[PDB]
Design a binder for this molecule. Structure first.
Ligand SMILES: *[C@@H]1O[C@H](CO)[C@@H](O[C@@H]2O[C@H](CO)[C@@H](O[C@@H]3O[C@H](CO[C@H]4O[C@H](CO)[C@@H](O)[C@H](O)[C@@H]4O)[C@@H](O)[C@H](O[C@H]4O[C@H](CO)[C@@H](O)[C@H](O)[C@@H]4O)[C@@H]3O)[C@H](O)[C@H]2NC(C)=O)[C@H](O)[C@H]1NC(C)=O
Ligand SMILES: *[C@@H]1O[C@H](CO)[C@@H](O[C@@H]2O[C@H](CO)[C@@H](O)[C@H](O)[C@H]2NC(C)=O)[C@H](O)[C@H]1NC(C)=O
Ligand SMILES: *[C@@H]1O[C@H](CO)[C@@H](O)[C@H](O)[C@H]1NC(C)=O
Lengths: 200, 119, 110, 201, 198
C-alpha cells in the first residue's frame, strides 16, 4: 500500500458553509491522501446514502485513484433524479449521471441552513435548453432562450425566457420543496497506480 | 450566547416620528430574520413588522402598514424601526425578537427585554 | 385576524388544564405550524411548544400540544406557582406576518 | 405514418375536475388521434412518472393501436401499490394490473384541490373482498361482507361491515395521507392497424 | 391433531383482574393459540386491532404474546390506543407510538361494581412525569404539589397518588367498569413459537 498518511479533506467539502447552485455544481478533485468512508456511512444525518458499483461497507478496503466530488443543492422531491438512467428537468438540463457510474450519492435535507424566511433566491437551476446535457457536463453559459420562432436577440419579451429559474426555499415550504444538499463521489479504476484510499 | 437589546424610546406627541434601534450579539446577525412585536397594555401580543435576513423583503401588519419602516445594517450589526404619525393607539411595549428560520419552524427563539413607548 | 383564545382558565395544583386556540382555513386549520409561548410579567417571552407538538430543549415534559381540525389545544399537567403567566397561540398564515391568539392567563388556586 | 391529423384528448382526462374513486376508476378509450406525450412529459408537475415496458423518451416515436386512460385518486404512500406484480390493499382489492403491463403511470399530488378542512369523504375505496381482483377488473357491488361464521344478510352486525370506506382527506395531513391523483395509460402493441400514433411527419 | 391449546381462558375468564396501575402481564409462548374463538365471540364490545388483520391472525406466528389486562372506566376506554393522551395514557398504561397487537374490552358491570361500591380498583392520578411504553409504577409515595416538602404525611398540597374508582351498578354505561386486555406480539430473533391451529 501507499505510505502516505495525510487525511483527505472530506470535512471541509461536506461541512462547507455554502453549496454551489445545481447549474454550476461545484466540482472538486481529491487525491494523494487517506480517506475514511466509515465515518460518513455511520452518521445517520445522511437521509440517502445510495451507491452503485461498490457496496458502502467495502469502501474502506478497495483502493481507488483520483476520486472526484460534485456538490450542489436541489429540491427535496426531485432528489430521485440524481441517479444513472434517470430522466427529468434537473437530470436533463442541469446534471446528468453516466449509465456506467461507479460511485456513491449522499443526499441530506438542509432545510435548517439553506431555507430562510425571506426566501433563499441564491439557488438557481436551468429551466430551458436546446438539447439534453451529456454526462458529467456543466452548462454555465446563459444569455437568452428562444421559443417563438423569432430572433430574440437580447430582450426577455414574449417567447423569450431567462434559462435560469430561482428556487423559493422557505422554512415552511412544505417538505418536498425543502432544499436538499447532494454530494456525489465518483471513483475510477484505471491502468495506473492508485493515489488515495483507506488505511491499513 | 445570543443576546438582543433595544434602545427604545419614551414619550412622543401624537403625529410625530420616533426611531428604535435593536442590536444583536452572539450569532451571525446577517443570517436570521427579525420580528418587531407589540403589546399594548391590557391587550394581547400582535406582530407589527418583519424584516428578512438581507433586508430585501419587508412585511407589516395591515393595521400599521404604510407608516412604519424597517431597515437593517449588517455591517454595524444593528437594525432600525422608524415610526411616523404616531397615534394614541400606538402606545405599547415593543420587542425585537429573532426568528428560528430553519430551526424551530415558525417560532421566535429569543426575545429582547423590550421597551415601552407612550404617546 | 387574531386567533380566538379563552380569556382565562383555572385549576388547583396537580390537576391538568387545557387552553384552546381557534382559527380558520388559512390558519392552524391549514398549515401545521402552530406554536405556544408564555409571557411572564416583566420578562421576555419564551417558546414552550413549536410545530404544534414538538417541544424546545429544557422545557418540562408536562407541557403537551395537539391540533384537531381547526383548533389547537395546549395541555399542561401538574401545575405549579411557576405557571402563573399568560400563554399565547401563534400560527403561520399564507403571509409571513404571523397571527397571534389572545391573552390566556392560567390561575392556580392557593 | 398514416395521414391523420388530430389532437388526442389528454387535456380533458388530465384536467378533469372530477376523478372517480378507486373502486370505480374511470376508464376512457383513446384512438384515432395524434398523441404528443412530450407535452405532459415536460409538464414538470408530475411527482411520479413510471413507464413499464416502454422508454418515456422513445414514446414520441412509438405507434400504438389502442390507448386506455384509467384515472382515480389514491392515498399518498399507497401510490407505490400501483405497479405490475405489486400486492397490498389497493393492488388486489380495487385496481389490479397485469403482470406483463406495457403502459405508464403518472401520479401527482392534489392536496390543495381535493382535501378540504374537516376531511373529505367523497372518495371511497373497498376494504374487504372475498377474493383478489383479476387484472383490469372493476367491482361496484356493495354487498355486505361477513367476516365471521354468522351468515348475516343486509345487516351491519358485529361481524358484517360495509365493503367500502372513506379516505377522509384533510389539508393537515403529512405526505403519505394526502390525496394523489393517478392516471394509468395502458398501451397495447397488438398486430392491428395502428390508430393512435406519434407525431413524426 | 392439535394439542396445548394455549390458556387464553384463564387470562380472559379470570376472577380478580388486577387494577390499572399494577396491570398484570401474562406471557404466552411455545404453544398453538386459537384466535378464532375470541374473534367470533360477540360479548367483546371492542376488538379493533393494529397491524395484523383480525381474520388473518391464525395464519401467522410470533416469538411471544404478552397479554396485559386490567379494569378501567367505560368513558375512557378510548385512552388505550397508540398516540392517545390522558390520565391512563400518561400515568398508568401507555401503549407504544407504534403497536402491533390487539385490544379487547367488554363491560363487566355484573361481575364488578358491588351495590355499596367496589372501591377496590385504584388508578394513579398524580405523577411527576409521564410513563414510557410498557412501564409499571407501584410507587406509593406522597406526591408533592407545591413547594412544601411533604414528609410522608398526607396534607394540604400533599396528595396520595391513588384514587379509588368506586364502581356501582347504577353508575351508567359511561361510568360502568370495563375489563380490558391488550395482546402484543413479539417477533424477536428467536424461533417462532406460537402459531395457528391449521
Ligand atoms: C390544464 O390547465 C392548465 C392551466 O389552465 C394548463 O397549463 C398549461 O398548459 C400548457 C399546454 O400546452 C403548457 O404548455 C406551455 O407552457 C409554457 C410555459 O410558459 C410559462 O411561462 C410563461 C412566461 O410568460 C407564462 O406566460 C405561461 O403562462 C407559463 O406559465 C407556455 O409559455 C406555453 O405557451 C405557448 O403556447 C403556444 C403553444 O404552446 C405558443 O405558440 C405560445 O407562443 C406560447 O409560447 C404553453 O402554455 C403550460 O406550461 C401550462 N401552464 C401551466 C401554468 O400549467 C394545462 O396545459 C392543462 N392541461 C393539462 C393536461 O394540464
Ligand atoms: C368464560 O366462561 C364462559 C362460561 O364458562 C365461556 O363461555 C363459552 O362461550 C362459548 C361461546 O358462546 C360456548 O361455546 C362455550 O360452551 C361457553 N363455555 C361453557 C363452559 O359453556 C367463555 O368461553 C369463557 N371465556 C373464554 C375467553 O373462553
Ligand atoms: C460536519 O459537522 C458535523 C457537526 O457535528 C460533524 O459531526 C461532521 O463530521 C462534519 N462533517 C464531516 C464530513 O465530518
Amino acid at each position: 500500500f501507499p505510505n502516505i498518511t495525510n487525511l483527505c479533506p472530506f470535512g471541509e467539502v461536506f461541512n462547507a458553509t455554502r453549496f454551489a447552485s445545481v447549474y454550476a455544481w461545484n466540482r472538486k478533485r481529491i487525491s494523494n491522501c487517506v480517506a475514511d468512508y466509515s465515518v460518513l456511512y455511520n452518521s445517520a444525518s445522511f437521509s440517502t446514502f445510495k451507491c452503485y458499483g461498490v457496496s458502502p461497507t467495502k469502501l474502506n478496503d478497495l483502493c481507488f485513484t483520483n476520486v472526484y466530488a460534485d456538490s450542489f443543492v436541489i429540491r427535496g422531491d426531485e432528489v430521485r433524479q440524481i441517479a444513472p438512467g434517470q430522466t427529468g428537468k434537473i437530470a436533463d438540463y442541469n446534471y446528468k449521471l453516466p449509465d456506467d457510474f461507479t460511485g456513491c450519492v449522499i443526499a441530506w435535507n438542509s432545510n435548517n441552513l439553506d431555507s430562510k424566511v425571506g426566501g433563499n433566491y441564491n439557488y438557481l437551476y436551468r429551466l430551458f435548453r436546446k438539447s439534453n446535457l451529456k454526462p458529467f457536463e456543466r452548462d454555465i453559459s446563459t444569455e437568452i432562450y428562444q421559443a417563438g420562432s423569432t430572433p430574440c436577440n437580447g430582450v426577455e419579451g414574449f417567447n423569450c425566457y431567462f434559462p435560469l429559474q430561482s428556487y423559493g426555499f422557505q422554512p415552511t415550504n412544505g417538505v418536498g420543496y425543502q432544499p436538499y444538499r447532494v454530494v456525489v463521489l465518483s471513483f475510477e479504476l484505471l491502468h495506473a497506480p492508485a493515489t488515495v484510499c483507506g488505511p491499513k | 450566547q445570543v443576546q438582543l437589546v433595544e434602545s427604545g424610546g419614551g414619550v412622543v406627541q401624537p403625529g410625530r416620528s420616533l426611531r428604535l434601534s435593536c442590536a444583536a450579539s452572539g450569532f451571525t446577525f446577517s443570517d436570521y430574520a427579525i420580528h418587531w412585536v407589540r403589546q399594548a397594555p391590557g391587550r394581547g401580543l400582535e406582530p407589527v413588522a418583519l424584516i428578512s435576513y438581507d433586508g430585501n423583503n419587508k412585511y407589516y401588519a395591515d393595521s400599521v402598514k404604510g407608516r412604519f419602516t424597517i431597515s437593517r445594517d449588517n455591517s454595524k450589526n444593528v437594525l432600525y424601526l422608524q415610526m411616523n404619525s404616531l397615534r394614541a393607539d400606538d402606545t405599547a411595549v415593543y420587542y425585537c425578537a429573532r426568528d428560528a428560520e430553519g430551526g424551530w419552524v415558525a417560532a421566535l427563539d429569543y426575545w429582547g427585554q423590550g421597551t415601552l413607548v407612550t404617546v | 385576524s387574531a386567533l380566538t383564545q379563552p380569556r382565562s382558565v383555572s385549576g388547583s395544583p396537580g390537576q391538568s388544564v387545557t387552553i384552546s386556540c381557534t382559527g380558520t382555513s388559512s390558519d392552524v386549520g391549514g398549515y401545521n405550524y402552530v406554536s405556544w409561548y408564555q409571557h411572564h410579567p416583566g420578562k421576555a417571552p419564551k417558546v414552550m411548544i413549536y410545530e404544534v407538538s414538538k417541544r424546545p430543549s429544557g422545557v418540562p415534559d408536562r407541557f403537551s400540544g395537539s391540533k384537531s381540525g381547526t383548533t389547537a389545544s395546549l395541555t399542561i399537567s401538574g401545575l405549579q406557582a411557576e405557571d402563573e403567566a399568560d400563554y399565547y397561540c401563534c400560527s403561520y398564515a399564507g403571509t409571513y406576518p404571523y397571527v397571534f391568539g389572545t391573552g390566556t392567563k392560567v390561575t392556580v388556586l392557593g
